[PDB]
DNA sequence: TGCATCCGTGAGTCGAGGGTAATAAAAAAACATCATGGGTTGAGTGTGGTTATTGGGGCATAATCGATCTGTA
């Protein structure tokens, strides 16, 4: 599976999940912790906003 | 101070079907409202019409060859 840009959820405007509905991968909170441990603030900013 | 009592907590990506149902009353009048159909505005898109032409061919008016019988050592 892979997704560049597709459907977005309705209430919260976030990408859906699952290969069946062509959903994006879930960037959980553990990986957010890992990124802020690295110090890569810009990668986090794009991962949370754009 | 000891007792019961209440109040948060407790993972992670993932897939596939994905929706089901105990019951109930009719009249009448009254009103609201959309639905269609026919008629004015009006808003177009449609179609011919006069008048600006600029290359082209044309006839004038000139011009430079091509062919033979009279004058000079």
Curated annotation (Swiss-Prot):
Biotech relevance, as the record puts it, is:
Co-administration of salinamide and rifampicin or salinamide and myxopyronin suppresses the emergence of resistance to both antibiotics.
Superkingdom of origin organism = Bacteria
Q: How is it modified after translation?
A: Acetylated on several lysine residues in the presence of glucose.
- Subunit structure comment from the entry: The RNAP catalytic core consists of 2 alpha, 1 beta, 1 beta' and 1 omega subunit. When a sigma factor is associated with the core the holoenzyme is formed, which can initiate transcription. The rRNA transcription and antitermination complex (rrnTAC) consists of RNAP, NusA, NusB, NusE (rpsJ), NusG, SubB, ribosomal protein S4, DNA and precursor rRNA; S4 is more flexible than other subunits. In pull-down experiments interacts with CedA. (Microbial infection) Interacts (via flap domain) with Escherichia phage lambda antitermination protein Q; this interaction renders bacterial RNAP resistant to transcription pausing and allows it to read through termination signals.
Briefly state the protein's biological role: DNA-dependent RNA polymerase (RNAP) catalyzes the transcription of DNA into RNA using the four ribonucleoside triphosphates as substrates. Resistance to the antibiotics salinamide A, salinamide B, rifampicin, streptolydigin, CBR703, myxopyronin, and lipiarmycin can result from mutations in this protein.
> Family assignment?
Belongs to the RNA polymerase beta chain family.
Name of the featured protein: DNA-directed RNA polymerase subunit beta
Q: Which organism is it from?
A: Escherichia coli (strain K12)
